[PDB]
Design a protein around this ligand. Structure first.
Ligand SMILES: Nc1ccc(Nc2ncnc3c2C(=O)CC=N3)cc1
Length: 303
């Protein structure tokens, strides 16, 4: 179509489960293009559907431009065009850099603000359904030039119909990255007919991402090396069984260093992590509550 024909692909930057991500140029500006083959049409269409949800746009949600198709004369490519963020993922950012107390708060509050907007139902003519991500992780969050995050990779999301309390694609199987799966997803006790259960599982995963950020917070030159949550307990690419034995049976969570109590911002962060990590989803903080707590902290620090 009219958009893809005017885009020039400059570099393939990532090759994932579904689709390949490229850095392209559109009307002189850098954009990201996720490309799917003809046999991945269902995944492409579902991601285009989620990104076109009414009232989705938010500073902490990846900005979607358009779906399109491009025929090179041999095969058709299915495209999803979105804003480009040079820093890439929060995972890449945390591996490359340490952050200040200000930096940590900015990354955490922006993530929580984006998740609170996804989770929020807006009632009305141009209403927004509540959405649960189902695959929140540091590799699925991007960092903007201004040091704030935006949630990306929304292709596995589910949307709620509040009038009937039903889910648009009626999920009946576990999806997502195994390392970030909530205890109830790992042991399959989650009620997949209950939308609020998917919101609570996203909060558990957000708590894990907060732990990744807080390790990289450098105060008086003291910080931890970058690690994925559970690096000390499971192998790379862990199985559901490996994760379940640690999270559900032994009931372990990532370690919270006692020295995080020595700094007020790290103390607030550690308390949020614990209150995201409860085995009972109903006891977890909401994204809106976390946004409120971190907003109070950002105001105190003068960010
Ligand atoms: N290492 C690595 C890290 C990140 C990516 N992806 C991206 N990077 C920059 N902007 C983006 C994207 C998207 O995926 C989607 C939209 N905008 C690819 C590879």
């Amino acid at each position: 179509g009219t958009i893809a024909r005017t885009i020039v692909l400059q570099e393939s930057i990532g090759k994932g489960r579904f689709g390949e991500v490229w850095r392209g140029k559109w009307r002189g500006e850098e954009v990201a293009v996720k490309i799917f083959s003809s046999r991945e049409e269902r995944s492409w269409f579902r991601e285009a559907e989620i990104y076109q949800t009414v009232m989705l746009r938010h500073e902490n949600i990846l900005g979607f431009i358009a779906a399109d198709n491009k025929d090179n004369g041999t095969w058709t490519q299915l495209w999803l065009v979105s804003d480009y963020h040079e820093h890439g993922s929060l995972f890449d950012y945390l591996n490359r850099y340490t952050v200040t107390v200000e930096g940590m708060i900015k990354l955490a509050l922006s993530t929580a603000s984006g998740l609170a907007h996804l989770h929020m139902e807006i009632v009305g003519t141009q209403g927004k359904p509540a959405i649960a991500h189902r695959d929140l992780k540091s590799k699925n969050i991007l960092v903007k030039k201004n040091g704030t995050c935006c949630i990306a990779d929304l292709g596995l999301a589910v949307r709620h119909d509040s009038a009937t309390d039903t889910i648009d694609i009626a999920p009946n199987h576990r999806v997502g990255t195994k390392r970030y799966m909530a205890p109830e997803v790992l042991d399959d006790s989650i009620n997949m007919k209950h939308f609020e259960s998917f919101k609570r599982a996203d909060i558990y995963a957000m708590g894990l991402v907060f732990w990744e950020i807080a390790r990289r917070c450098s105060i008086g030159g003291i910080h931890e090396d970058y690690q994925l949550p559970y690096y000390d307990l499971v192998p790379s690419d862990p199985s559901v069984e490996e994760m379940r034995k640690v999270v559900c049976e032994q009931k372990l969570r990532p370690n919270i260093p006692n020295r995080w109590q020595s700094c007020e911002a790290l103390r607030v962060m550690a308390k949020i992590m614990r209150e995201c990590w409860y085995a009972n989803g109903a006891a977890r903080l909401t994204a809106l509550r976390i946004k409120k707590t971190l907003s109070q902290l950002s105001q105190q620090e003068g960010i």
